[model samples]
Target: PTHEFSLDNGLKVIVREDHRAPVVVSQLWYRIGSSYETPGLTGLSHALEHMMFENAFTTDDYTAYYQVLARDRLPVALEMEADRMAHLSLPVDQFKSEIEVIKEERRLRTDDNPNALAFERFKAAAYPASGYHTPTIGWMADLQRMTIDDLRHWYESWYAPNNATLVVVGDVTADEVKTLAKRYFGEIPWRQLPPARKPLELAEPGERRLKLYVRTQLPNLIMGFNVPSLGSSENPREVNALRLIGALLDGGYSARLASRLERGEELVAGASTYYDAFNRGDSLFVLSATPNVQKGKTLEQVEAGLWKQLDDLKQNPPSAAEIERVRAQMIAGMVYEKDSIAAQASSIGQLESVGLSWKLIDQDLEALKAVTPDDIQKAARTYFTPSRLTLAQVLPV
Candidate 1:
């Protein structure tokens, strides 16, 4: 079971007790992330994420710090987190060292990696004027120029008790957890919160595309369709339906893309679909594919095949059996997640940090079960339009 409340300094705390093991997971989440960043500070949130292990972190619209320890070590985790929340040391020399480390980290993750580079370009093209446009690792140029003052300002401005939430799950009593939290976190003072984020008003007027040439043997293609998230949409049913659609397309070996496209037609070596339904801003229903050169497949052929599958969804609604199967799988996955204390805490923290109540987990599950075939087809036809599409392709050198 879970118990939730607020501290005197406005810190939100959620506790879930599981006596299954003498271990606990403690998490502190601040409602800030890369999306909260500005033009010059694109990767600051993630940079801070790296710094967090060194000391303390925040990103896209939130920053989270977590630790897993034996039950007896719970107080130690609370003390360390509370101490950093109120007082973190960001010496200039240390900051510079970490910045260089992050730059090298970016090089290895994004610069040197072709697929990651392609996605970075895809995001930039998909959200030209929105805060989501920039990579969380930040632009190489901006990272090279970021100063210690910038890091300090960002830390002081957003890391406040009022803007944060605490989630703990494991073998502990709620009352005991609260007492320890009060001793460590209750005395910390709150700062004036940052101003509300500006709404993302930019819209994609037409199909946007990007082509990247990188040192690779295989051709990779990524497509992103701008779509509504759970919080951004008024219709929770529609958001839930989108999630089901993603599953139907590529959820498992029996799914449409895997069963038909990959095995029956053998058009590509691999294909997958992803939906970002739970986010603070508009999200993407993304599709990625790697062409099978051994079978003489090309990126163009794979892309056309993908479009046909999507068009089929728009034209013909999925059957009731397909909807039920995907829903059952989704529910089963959620059930398994409950078995993990860390997952339980993370799920609650993520939901609450994104301005959603943890109770919505049940509501979303119900919504998923209630979805009909027509709902799936309608969501696809409505949001999966060419006008909202952005494509990124990586070509072999």
Candidate 2:
């Protein structure tokens, strides 16, 4: 069962009691993400997620939740988000340690991983001036230079109950959880969190390309196009359209991109396209591939091949057979997702936290079943345009 209420302080609290087993799950979501970050502080929100576990300066100890969860063997995963309504807290000293850790994390995850490296570049080129260009991990320079005062200021400006949602799932009863929530959280007097501010980038003004040399045995390239964010429902139809486009292009091994690129001797190890629809602002539809050859017509072939496929898709929607195969794959994926209780709670809570109906989970399959091929093609045509494109290429130095 699920319980929802608003605190007198204007905080939205969601409590779900899953007494399925002795174990219980809890989550607190503040309406924040990378999209809320400004230019210099690329990863502030995400970094704050880490700081949540770090020691508090005033208390001279870690968050009570952290210690309690750790002692109980319950791992709490926190997300620093943008576009959500709430903000987070990072006391000074802990904020300092987290800054270093975030920089180190970026170095290890993005700088070291070849695929991640290419993707970082691709996003930078794709989003241009919007926060989309920044990494969720934040930029190294910004993280390193960010002071406790900076974080405090950011928290003061953004982390408000009005802008945040808290969800708790696990062994506790909903009533007990609420009581605890009020004990720990209710006392946090409300603050005037700032009104929503969205940055503007000029409309699909044009396309941009990038080329980079890195130390790698393989060469890779990625291309992307900017599209609407989840918050901008002005073109609500565009959401379903893009979902169809993603399904057609990268649904599975038998899908066009994989089959065409991976055919005959693995010249191209893998290729796929993804549409990230989670953002509060604009989103990016991405296509990336890793090629065996250091240099050749392969790059040209990959680019041209995609355009040809797009042309084909535009002219003729995916066949019934192709559509069924994609549908089955998606169904299987959703089935797999249902395996974890935490996953289920997280998924439901996120939709609820973001103002989307939690009923989406129960209705997702039916919705997909109803999608027509024309829906996919129309979405592709709408968001996938040269003017909206950004390209990134990574080759070994």
Candidate 3:
């Protein structure tokens, strides 16, 4: 069982006791991400994430500072986090140096990586009027111009007790955990948070397409369908059904994409489908493929193979047996996650960070069990329309 409560300063704390090991995982999550950013401040959240690691830890939607330590060392970790939380010293020189490091990180992760560069352009074209348009790494131009003051302002604005949650999972008692939390975090004064930003309301009028020419060995293709997620959809079962769809296509080698496209037909080198029904706003159901140039396959052939699989989902739907198999695989995956203290803490923090309850992990499993073949078919047909599509291709230059 998990115990949850709030501090005087409005910091939510969750404790899950597991005495199987003499270790603990502690995490501090702040409720801010790229979703809270604006045009000029794109990637501020991620930049802060990198900067926070200098003294603490931080990410997008929510920044998390987490540590896994022996039960005896728990107090030390807590003290370090609390100290940084209350009084992080951001000297101008260090901040400037960090920005340069982040820029190089962007170059390595995005600019120089062909698939990453393609996806960046894909997101920009996909969410032109929304916060999700920019990469978490920010635009090159924006990063070059961002100042130390910008980083400081962002940190001060969002890193407040009222905007944070504390998650601890380990071999400890709830009472003891609460006592330590109160000792460390109780006195930090809460600040007034800025008014909630209006949620994204942009609509896709038609199919959007982008092509990136990069010096790469093989061509890559990405297709994104604007889709409702756990945070955005009122229908929990719908999201679960969509998750099943992704698993059916790419969960393992036995999955349809790998079995049929890669091995059976030998049409592509690799292919996969992904959908996460958790985000601060609407999310995407994405399909990606790498062409098998050695097999004389082109990007067009790979894409056609992908579309064939999608069209089959709309037309044939899945069998009852197929749905049950994937459902069991998902359950097994969840059970495996519970075997790790870090995974348990991450699950709790991730759920709460995205405006969900940790209890939903069980509820989600039940929802997955209830997903009918018809439900999977309906989700694919309803959400995977032409107008909602954003296609991005990376052509070998």
Q: For every model in order, what is the number of clashing pairs?
A: 11, 20, 2
Lowest lDDT 10-residue stretch of candidate 3: 52-61
For each candidate in turn, the TM-score is 0.96, 0.83, 0.96
Q: Write the per-residue lDDT of candidate 1 for residues 1-397, one digit (tens) a residue.
A: 8898888899988888899899999999998788888887678878766766612345566788888889899998899999888876877788889999989988998878877887888888888666677777899888998987887788898889999999999999889988998999999887898885632625454698888998777888898888878767888888888899998999877888988888889997889998877787777889999887788898899899999999999999988987888778877877987668887788888898778899886576777888888998898888888898998888978
Per-residue error for 396 in candidate 3, Å, reads 1.4
Summarize candidate 2's per-residue lDDT along 7-114 as a digit string, tens digits. 777766666666556665544455566656777766666655566552211100001121113214332222222222234544666766667777887898888886
Best by lDDT: 1
Between 1 and 2, whose lDDT is larger? 1
C-alpha lDDT of all candidate models, in order: 0.83, 0.63, 0.82
Tell me the RMSD of model 2 versus the true structure: 5.6
Candidate 3, 101-179: lDDT as tens digits: 9899889989888778887888777775666776778888889989878887887888888888888899988999889
Decreasing lDDT order of the candidates: 1, 3, 2
Superposed model 2: Cα runs more than 4 Å off: 54-98, 170-173, 198-203, 264-267, 292-297, 352-355
